[PDB]
Design a protein around this ligand. Structure first.
Ligand SMILES: [Cl-]
Ligand SMILES: [Cl-]
Lengths: 166, 166
């Protein structure tokens, strides 16, 4: 159930994929105070990407939608090249630059930025920022990357931490 | 196996959906002299819309891709409102204006124009223009619209005829 690659989903002056934008805007009107964002379970495979009734969806459906979007891309959001460059920076410890162009291509970088902005807003609603950032890393790491076995989680955790600093 | 609606697939300054653009450009480099465009049989349902290897596809696969694109939209390319306004013009006989904004929304009109341009190029490769235009109407009519039972075919036939005049 594979979506087009990110360059085929949007172009500047748009700064994020419309499907992701629709899910994020929906979920942020209704359910930023939800635990659903933090759930690492994979949703049932999505075949209907119309989002025809997305504004009537419950927070769980929307959170699942965001996860399904990431899993539906033909290749992971964070590329192997970008992963390896983050890994080298993260090991030799700011990972942020590693996940920007040219290292991470424009569409992917924009998409990652849009997602991190959303995940920051979720984190800030939580009772404790640090634990939230950690839980969100554990959930979204594997979705974005698809050697330490927690590297994906640690990378997203650090990227979110850096976003929140700024 | 439903794609996003056309407004979620592209925005100006793009003038057509990238997936359709990729299939059309592919098919027009390789196989404008093919009978495959004229085949009314429905393709197997497509679930992979990555087009990751689209430039290695045979003409039959590409022609099927274009048909699958039209069938994968959440609602027909030509709206019921636009269909009824074309039907009234076509009955009282130029249908063209009826399938332009506001009657047919911007994204759909742009997409229809891009497709008709492609179908015109196919028609002009054929041994006889009139018969080709008729065969293409019969094939694409039902895909675009989803009372005369040949109305969809007649509408596309006339729209293509009008395009070729200009
Ligand atoms: Cl990209
Ligand atoms: Cl539209």
């Amino acid at each position: 159930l594979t979506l087009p690659d990110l360059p085929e989903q949007f172009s500047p002056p748009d700064v994020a994929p419309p499907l992701l934008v629709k899910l994020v805007e929906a979920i942020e009107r209704t359910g930023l105070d939800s635990e659903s964002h933090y759930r690492p379970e994979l949703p049932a495979p999505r075949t209907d990407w119309s989002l025809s009734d997305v504004d009537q969806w419950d927070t769980a459906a929307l959170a699942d939608g965001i996860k399904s979007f990431l899993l539906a891309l033909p290749a992971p959001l964070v590329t192997p090249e970008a992963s390896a460059e983050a890994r080298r920076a993260l090991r030799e410890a700011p990972v942020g630059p590693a996940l920007e162009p040219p290292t991470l291509p424009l569409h992917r970088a924009l998409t990652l930025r849009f997602l991190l902005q959303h995940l920051g807003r979720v984190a800030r609603r939580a009772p404790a920022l640090g634990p939230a950032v950690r839980a969100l890393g554990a959930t979204f790491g594997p979705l974005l990357l698809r050697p330490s076995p927690d590297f994906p989680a640690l990378l997203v955790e650090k990227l979110l931490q850096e976003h929140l600093e700024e």
